Amino acid sequence: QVQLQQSGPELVKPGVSVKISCKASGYSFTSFYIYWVKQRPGQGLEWIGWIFPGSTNTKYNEKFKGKATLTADTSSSTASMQLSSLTSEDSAVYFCARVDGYAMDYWGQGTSVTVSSAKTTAPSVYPLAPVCGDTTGSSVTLGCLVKGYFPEPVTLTWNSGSLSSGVHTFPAVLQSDLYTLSSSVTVTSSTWPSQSITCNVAHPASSTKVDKKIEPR
Amino acid sequence: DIVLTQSPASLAVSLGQRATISCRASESVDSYGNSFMNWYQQKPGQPPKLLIYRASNLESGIPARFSGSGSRTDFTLTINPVEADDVATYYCQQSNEDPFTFGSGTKLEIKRADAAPTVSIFPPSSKLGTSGGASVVCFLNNFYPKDINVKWKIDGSERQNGVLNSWTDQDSKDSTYSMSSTLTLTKDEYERHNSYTCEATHKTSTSPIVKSFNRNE
16 A cells, blocks of 8 residues: 655744655655655646655756755655755645656645744634524534634544534635634534534644534523 | 646536646657656645546546547547546646646636525624634535625624635535635624624525624624
8 A cells, every 4th residue: 555644734934944754655665766746825836856765866856956955764764855945935835756657656645834934823712603592493504713823724623523524614814924714514403402513623833632612602 | 847838727517528628738748759748636635646647548546537638749638527526626747858847737617506605694702702802704605606705794884804705615526615704803893883794695696695693682
């Protein structure tokens, strides 16, 4: 089972280098090429360079030559990319891809790097119960508000992941150097508030795991 | 280095119909004998998935309905028939020489029957008041098409300052859109006024769906 496991999200200050790791499992690490691809948010794909885990052999894109350096450790079977002095135009999603000539077969999740020079802030979770008044019926919706956090992302979960079918998770939009994001779950009136529906919110930078039960107001 | 352009930039195709995607090249990638053109499918939040390599040869696990063709500079990808889970941005990449370049992007979207949004208004939580904030949330779930405008009204008068909007990507099953709007206000501004209405105009009906709540309860 061929897999590529990339590291988590990254928040960096301008003028600081960063290493991005890509763990490979399910195949012989030293026999296949590994290509690296950059993705500017809301834009296309950019090839950065390839690395052959066997021995020191790399070819880079001329646009990335003096910025990206590729290394691979054979013992840990991990491909690593260092990006020197990150700017505003470097805040992107970086991918690692396994290539068997001449197409990229397997991919990693992609590490979201944001630069970004702001302070890391704690998220605030708020439960959204239906409008005041003892029920309405048929099928009622529930919401979860995550107000004022930095940086991306926030993983939203409902009841640990059991009721994840009628869920609308909304992409985060930046306002005054702060991110805001919401999620809504639509369920039948028979299963609420008879069945306890909880909001699970996780944030990596602040290291906060706030769990809030939605109770009628 | 080798410019790859994709036409059209965006196409709308009904469920079960044929979609044509072109990929023009600035240099002949088919050099040496065979075409070195690859095709990818990328859903939002996910890495690109290889569909067809060398214009003709499909990757194992990819259905036969995904068909690619072309030689020299002109290349085409077709999906027949299309399904609900085909909502993605498709890319063509080239090997050959010399720094590897991706295409230009062509977003696929599905046309279906027009749907009316189920509007749900949510008052600020009791924990928001303690922190000093007041955010009124309004969810518009499962509607078609994407074109929709949300207008906030406080005590009969429109408010445009502090409105945060976010639109979701097309559903992988329903092929519908969803939107959320929030009035980022303070506790001081919230307690002065009483009525808060969430209004949305759509192509489905001339009358706007108005969902409102009173603080008086």
